What we know:
- Chain B: InterPro entries: Thiolase, Thiolase-like, Thiolase_C, Thiolase_N.
- 4 copies of one chain form a homotetramer.
- By secondary structure, chain A is α+β, with helices and mostly antiparallel strands.
- Chain A has 13 helices and 14 strands.
- Chain A has 2 domains: 1-124 and 197-276, Peroxisomal Thiolase, Chain A, domain 1; 139-196 and 277-397, Thiolase/Chalcone synthase (Peroxisomal Thiolase, Chain A, domain 1, 3-Layer(aba) Sandwich).
- Chain A has helices at 25-40, 64-71, 89-102, 141-148, 159-171, 175-194, 198-201, 223-227, 262-267, 293-303, 321-330, 347-350, 357-372; strands at residues 4-10, 14-15, 50-53, 80-84, 108-116, 122-124, 139-140, 205-207, 210-212, 251-260, 274-283, 313-316, 376-383, 387-395.
- The two termini of chain A are 16 Å apart.
Amino acid sequence: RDAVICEPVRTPIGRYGGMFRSLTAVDLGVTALKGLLERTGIAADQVEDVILGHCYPNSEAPAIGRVVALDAGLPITVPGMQVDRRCGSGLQAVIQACLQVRSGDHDLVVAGGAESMSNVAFYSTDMRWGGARTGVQIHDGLARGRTTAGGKFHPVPGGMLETAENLRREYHISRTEQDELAVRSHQRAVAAQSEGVLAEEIIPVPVREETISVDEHPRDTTVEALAKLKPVLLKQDPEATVTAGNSSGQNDAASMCIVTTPEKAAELGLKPLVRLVSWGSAGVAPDLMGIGPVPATEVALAKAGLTLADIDLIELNEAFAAQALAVMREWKFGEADHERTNVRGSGISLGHPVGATGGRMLATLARELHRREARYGLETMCIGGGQGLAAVFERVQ
Amino acid sequence: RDAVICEPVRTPIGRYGGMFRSLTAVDLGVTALKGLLERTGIAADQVEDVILGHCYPNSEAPAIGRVVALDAGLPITVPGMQVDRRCGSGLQAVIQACLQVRSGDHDLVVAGGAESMSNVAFYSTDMRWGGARTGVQIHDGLARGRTTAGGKFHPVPGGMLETAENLRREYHISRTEQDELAVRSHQRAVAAQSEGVLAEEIIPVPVRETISVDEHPRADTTVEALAKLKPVLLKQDPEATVTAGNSSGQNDAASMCIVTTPEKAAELGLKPLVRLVSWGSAGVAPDLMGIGPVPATEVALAKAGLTLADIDLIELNEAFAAQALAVMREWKFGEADHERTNVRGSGISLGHPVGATGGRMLATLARELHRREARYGLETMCIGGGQGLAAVFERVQE
Amino acid sequence: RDAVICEPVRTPIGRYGGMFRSLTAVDLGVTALKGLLERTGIAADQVEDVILGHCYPNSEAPAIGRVVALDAGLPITVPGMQVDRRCGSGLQAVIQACLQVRSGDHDLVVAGGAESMSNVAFYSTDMRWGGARTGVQIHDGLARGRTTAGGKFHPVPGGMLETAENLRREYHISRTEQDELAVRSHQRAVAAQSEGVLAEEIIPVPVRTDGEETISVDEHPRADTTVEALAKLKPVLKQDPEATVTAGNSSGQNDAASMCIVTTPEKAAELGLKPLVRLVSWGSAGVAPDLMGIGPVPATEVALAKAGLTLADIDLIELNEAFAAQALAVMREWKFGEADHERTNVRGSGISLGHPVGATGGRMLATLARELHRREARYGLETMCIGGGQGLAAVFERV
Amino acid sequence: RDAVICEPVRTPIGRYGGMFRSLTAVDLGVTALKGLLERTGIAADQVEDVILGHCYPNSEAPAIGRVVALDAGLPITVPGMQVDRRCGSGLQAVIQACLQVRSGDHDLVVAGGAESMSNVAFYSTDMRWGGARTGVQIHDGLARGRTTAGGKFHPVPGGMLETAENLRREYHISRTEQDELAVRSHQRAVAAQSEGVLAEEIIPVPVREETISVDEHPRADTTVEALAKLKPVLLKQDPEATVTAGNSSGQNDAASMCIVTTPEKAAELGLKPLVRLVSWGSAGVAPDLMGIGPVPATEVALAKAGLTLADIDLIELNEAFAAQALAVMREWKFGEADHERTNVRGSGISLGHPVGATGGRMLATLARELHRREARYGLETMCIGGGQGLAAVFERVQ
């Protein structure tokens, strides 16, 4: 039996240190979850699991899906969990949920993600047994993660950014093209804001006293202003092109959806948007992580009996413009194809709040697939440490 | 298609601050995984995913399955990830693994868990935007997490331990009953050591000599000796029963297995031990978290068309002896059922290296099933925060 | 032989988190020491000690007088040190300097204080040997310090603020009296800026932001300060609802440094210095910690006794206003008429100026000495309450 | 009028993480002060200030002299304070006390030092306004201090060790000579213990109950050969390295107290003055060469006294590293006989270097020894981290 997605939602996405800084990852999750149930009218006891992608957990919220369910006020009956496959964790939660559903184990579950990058921890592995002989190192969680993902044999001191630079180098990607992609990202996000489509996606968030519905970071952005910015690794390398302007930031948000059967959705009065056709996962070289989408997509299209040409709409994460352009090069893109890809924006304009990112992409794909009455959508992303995840979704009718 | 478990293995289990103190979770993970690949002769490129239960993640190892896979020398083409459902994380990884294999997405994966409780971080959320007004707090990851898992509306100040005391009060479990259970646990584990069954389970770990034996189990453990210990929260409850002796510790370990189809195992020369029949999960009151196996087992058995009496072997996590005993009251157990339960030992004697516990149970359950030529096994655990997880396994007869 | 104070100076005084937040205590001291030397023309090697009052030391600068000297470009042959007597530390450094000069041991020394409250450390004693058993605590240096000063037998959980309320209560001082005093303080301070007397005291500070700019003015003082506005403000009330002490009527937390030269009249003459005052006597006392604000009364008593002097003998007083109530209590005990307020804290005080602890004694010295000259008065008194139950007072004579 | 020292005393000195690990600096200070008062019968209202050398102060004890008086049950009328001049802070407290006294300002004061190196805080300056951009460092107070004492134009990444290796290089001091000095230091210290003289100095400390009277570090067995076996701390980077844990002083816990007064006031109280302070000197040296600071400092003090080094019966020189002390002794043109009159009851190497309390320890030995000997002149001198020296000359009272 099929697995279908209903009411995929998100909060607004805040900047690191910005709008949502007073809010925990849990507060955002709850807000997204309350909104999901509130829009749906679903009885709390209908939810059989809450599965949440969450990339920077600590003991403030163990097994974060369960904490988020309780905090949202669902009954003690409702189980929950946390998953991490990096930048792909949101999609992963979704995939797990569909698997749990299709099997016939569960009829309805929640799949989501939450990240508060603003409030990620600083930690020490030196204070337990003492620093009397070694000193004390305290690591920023965001910063350390950037270099450790590849493990011991594939270190990257320059982190995520260094991977993109490698890509720009390997594909001869001009700075201009990169800045250009970014503009589109902003124009599209902004266009979406004012065309009213975004309200469909968003649960507004109350901050102790006002309520927020608009994503903080999308902006007036021109190729000319972007040309001005100084790349991060210019001193390390003089041919750098990656800047804050052409790359996604660090952000706060949550994403929620319902994963259910068509039969169950009909009973609960729900309106399913897509069903999951297939998915694929891949490993790639960690220093080349930005390319993980290509092998993963290939696997997914094959499982689907599908071709990329067959595909109506694409959500490809814009971790770095350079990274995205490289996948698009491999996909042999034509100026039209940029029509069907990232239509409402992406990481660069929106933000990249890592756990919630897969959800955001889904909310946009599925809903947009509806608005267009289009058949197939692709969701795919690169993963820090050398991974890729992709999923194929089909509109319901 | 079926999902079957092949070659389920673990490292030995170190004590907190003990023999594996110098080892990261990743190091244990890598050793378990390498051992598994070595024992099986499997080409590395065969492994389509590595899913790992891991309950205290930090930035030293993001998405830990992937890191363990790289650090073990597997090719860059192999994906990996991290899962947390607390004390149920190892089972959860296995279940996810079966779902992926069964759907026909993957033909072979590794499921496992790793934990180093010895090296769990201390952490703060006050150092990034300033402690100017708040003050700064640094939290022990192990301690802080025992309290918060229930969230804001279900706080447990006493921790996992209070919940255990809660069950002891409700179900009227005596001190003697608990200590007694602890004794069996040590005797069964030690006996498992002497009988040589353990070697089949264990990946030896080199430390800078080589270790093949679990640290915690003690031959001389007696009831009279256990009676001497001071219950942890005597000060607060004079009726407290739960001591270090009758509860599990904090531990270091790793677990890995192969999850595969029967046709794929045949092709590769594997010996599949069990196939997964069903699972169930449940939520319970967070202050009563120890009872979680009862509803979960209920769900798993019923999906299986099975009854508790149908079950040949049970592994139930002994998080606390009062917690385990309470589950047994619901199950209406008797001295005889005690001979089909936790037969090689448990969390009390063995220790509770949390992301890897599900893995350790599975290794025993699967192997003991094969040793007994019995049919059905149940693996179930209580989960901090108020959860239960259960699975029913069937011996592969071939 | 006499000891005289030459060219007493200070930086501007910054608010906690404000102007100088990017500056260390060392940075401020160095700017002051350099300013002192630039003004004097003194060769660096004339300096035989740098003694600094510094109340929140850590290992960023051990023995901070030595570090401040080296960092200011003084030769390696110059010794330096750190002293702590809390709110009294700056004066204490002056007195030590004076004694080492008077004994004939040293001919010229530098006496000072530096404090950056903005940058005070957070610290833990649970980090060295393991946190598994106890938990790990980190303390804000500033906050923890308000309770510990009395030791175990006399903890004051309230802090300095509580000891002030204790004084209000004992001496029956209305919130009105307290609030009026604060007004004068801002008024005397502001007046002193426009009058231009402050430039004499101040070494200007450069801060790098768009450009690097130089600061000459104290952050905190306000002209617009009125009793009425001060009533709008909430005592620090839940605890005692007869609470009268607000952020408005007490000193805050601050960043500044102070320096001066201590020398013989004969040496000052050789080097072309203009000695302003000489030290006549000093006194120190202990009082109950929960009553710390009153410490000046006993210390002052002892100093005048040693001087053979009386309070009427005193033309100028600088009494630190840690709290308006604290200052008022001292003044009653001194039997102060309305006119005596004429000669006390004429250029402002802690409430308007701020209270950067190690540098405070230096700041007051700078006013008393210069004002004594501008006035052509004879005798000045410097005195302060000290956290933990102490007082320090000194008498100076214009030269 | 003169300033004289009466009843100089100390606690025993314990090792880093040792016997006194559960005691604060204040605790040691209180015991020492209490013992001093118990011994002398001094009326608590006779003490006009308590001046304490304290090197690693924190908010646990502000103005530590005042806290110590209070905690030791002195009346609230008694003021107190803290001073730091590194390794010279204890002597610096004495010189201050003597100056306040000779002045006529006070008739009687207490001067001391207290250090608990065990409990020195770890700190950050990144927490207050946040590390959101910069990161967070936490510094060990001991290790961090060793690099910063010279300031930004003279950093010593090597710490005090690097200064000591700089001295052995410059002065060419062999490893054997360094080890020989260390051996003498242990032998002299142990001898002082057999002989019974040490009791004269020591205030026994109670810990929770057992009472401690003996310094922790000194060992009778120490030999050159055993010492040769140790490895120089800085060998990786210097092939010629000599300085080791064996021939350097450790990190230590202790307190020192004494009475400073005039002869007239001492006559009144029926006190027994031991020495009077003749002179003192202070000096600045290069921070990379800090160990040599005694040489210019001794020169100043001897000169002020109209005195010569030949005139000095007894010397207490801090043995911070054997190499540093040996270097000073070279400048001083010492011959075999000189070792006869220097550090006669042990030193920093055997006893320990509890930094705030070190000036007090040396004084207690010197004043007391000078009396037993019936000798006239004594010298106390130490090197100070960051590039300083302090020396004082003391003369036996008749």
